[PDB]
């Protein structure tokens, strides 16, 4: 049984370790401090309550996101406006390798979409994914995110540029 809870500061070291092991983009300490303290970043952790060795509270998946103003986002021209509209930008999403292919990422995205639906001013959820990340791309397409843009040379990794795709899930009639 996988359970879900907000990220808290006891997750800090685990969160940092997973990120540097599964994302080629490197993040600074202040990002993780911001995630675990709550504040302006919203996040969900996935935990396996049955793990032994006292790791039954260690997260095995996560999603982090922030609320942005729609009018000041890169997809402002795509949205239909109605309070000031906002968007939820998914910052990072990942599942530990031995826990993949069980629907945990789908459940985490659903938690983000459910959250965003509950905000009347919210116009959708969007994210960037690196080109050729086929497991993630298939997931977003499976959950009805639309690819609206290919950003040439978006990511800088070890001195080389890689494309990203911008995926959007439109909400509340936007």
């Amino acid at each position: 049984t996988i359970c879900f809870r907000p990220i808290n500061p006891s997750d800090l070291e685990r969160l940092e370790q997973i990120h540097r092991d599964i994302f080629p983009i490197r993040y600074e300490s202040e990002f993780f401090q911001n995630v675990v303290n709550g504040g302006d970043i919203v996040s969900w952790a996935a935990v396996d309550r049955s793990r032994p060795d006292g790791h039954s509270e260690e997260l095995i998946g996560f999603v982090t996101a922030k609320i942005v103003l729609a009018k000041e986002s890169e997809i402002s021209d795509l949205i239909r406006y109605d309070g000031e509209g906002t968007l939820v930008y998914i910052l990072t999403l990942g599942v530990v390798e031995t826990y993949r292919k069980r629907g945990i990422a789908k459940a985490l995205i659903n938690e983000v979409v459910k959250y965003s639906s509950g905000i009347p001013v919210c116009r959708g959820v969007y994210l960037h994914v690196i080109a050729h990340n086929n497991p993630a791309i298939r997931l977003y397409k499976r959950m009805s995110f639309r690819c609206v843009r290919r950003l040439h040379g978006f990511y800088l990794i070890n001195g080389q540029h890689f494309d990203s795709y911008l995926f959007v899930y439109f909400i509340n009639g936007s």
């Binding site: 983009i25 490197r26 990072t92 999403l93 960037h128 800088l156 990203s164």
Partner: peptide, 4 residues
């Protein structure tokens, strides 16, 4: 994955 948000950029750097």
């Amino acid at each position: 994955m948000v950029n750097a």
